[PDB]
Homo-oligomer: 142 residues x 3
């Protein structure tokens, strides 16, 4: 059993290593980030991530944020994050409903005045509140 | 132990998620379909799949069939399936020897009269009996 | 439990199968080889492999050697191996410090006279001792 678990864990690290080495994904803690390289709107990204068994990416730590930023930088495009504006303007929540804890707004943001209910990440990693209909890099977390 | 199994299962879903998101494979039930994008003959596909630890794909449900059809459609090529004609013309078997259950013949097929011992899938998902020497998209199941 | 371990092992083989079929890696025994396709110096390859959770590749059997050779052949470039010269010229060690067992030197090699502390693999699989600053295919083992 112990010999079987080792082998299983070894093989997992091998496949994760291969995917990591080839830039197919980024591992941060227990979270894995990945993109299909496509630029689509918020609703479309949501579907793509869930179809793959994951969710539209959302950073909850500075290290997770930088990981997504590096992907945004790599593809030279902004990234829609897994959060939307509440009823009260300026207040945002994760898709499960919980209010956002970690934030990294670009100075002055959010200021869409309730008209920009989605959140995009600039290539430097800072956030901007934005309409949900733009074409943005699809980044998922697993 | 339970904490170790969760982590293992979590990491598996992560790697499967990454491969899924990037179109490297399709998951249907307990079956995974994948292609190397190459177009070769029946014998060559057989070898490639087994070298990868899998088998030349064969659909046994409508959902498995549509999955392979989507790959055929994606690469704009027909797909050799994991089945060949018996001694009696019009009767086909899986490679283990068992007679074919689920079928999706294009109307009028099979009618190769025993001269077309292999089976190819059109891009709409329907089947045609065919000679085994054509260049076809290599699709494997794992 | 036994049903859970089977499923886990099945899914592992599926992901390994997909990666194998698509040429993303080579499996030899319990060792997996992979490349990101990049050509950089020894120190850079070392870092890339360890960042992915692996190590710069080193063959310890003829089958492992041929596996790496095939990758070298595929990318038409030589490969830096995971070994460097001791203080005594002509003597080489693995990166953990242990002296090299299996070798496959091209005839006459090594003869860098202590000036060529790294080891490169030619596309035919044979070894040459070389300076560590050249651009070589980055191949990792996991
Ligand atoms: C996509 N882009 C961020 C590089 C520029 C275009 O952005 P946008 O027109 O959707 O606001
Ligand atoms: C490959 N193709 C199906 C698109 C057309 C050619 O098919 P075939 O000549 O092998 O019968
Ligand atoms: C890279 N190469 C092996 C194909 C030729 C150049 O090699 P080198 O100039 O680094 O010695
Ligand atoms: Ca804004
Ligand atoms: Ca026919
Ligand atoms: Ca030399
Ligand atoms: Na707003
Ligand atoms: Na026939
Ligand atoms: Na030397």
């Amino acid at each position: 059993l112990q010999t079987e678990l080792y082998e299983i864990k070894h093989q997992i690290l091998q496949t994760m290593g291969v995917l990591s080495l080839q830039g197919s994904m980024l591992s941060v803690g227990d979270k894995v980030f990945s993109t299909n390289g496509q630029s689509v709107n918020f609703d479309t990204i949501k579907e793509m991530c869930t179809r793959a068994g994951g969710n539209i990416a959302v950073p909850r730590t500075p290290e997770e944020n930088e990981a997504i930023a590096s992907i945004a930088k790599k593809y030279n495009n902004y990234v829609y994050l897994g959060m939307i504006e509440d009823q009260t303007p300026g207040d945002f929540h994760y898709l499960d409903g919980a209010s956002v804890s970690y934030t990294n707004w670009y100075p002055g943001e959010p200021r869409g005045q309730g008209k920009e209910k989605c959140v995009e990440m600039y290539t430097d990693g800072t956030w901007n509140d934005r309409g949900c209909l733009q074409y943005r890099l699809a980044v998922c977390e697993f």
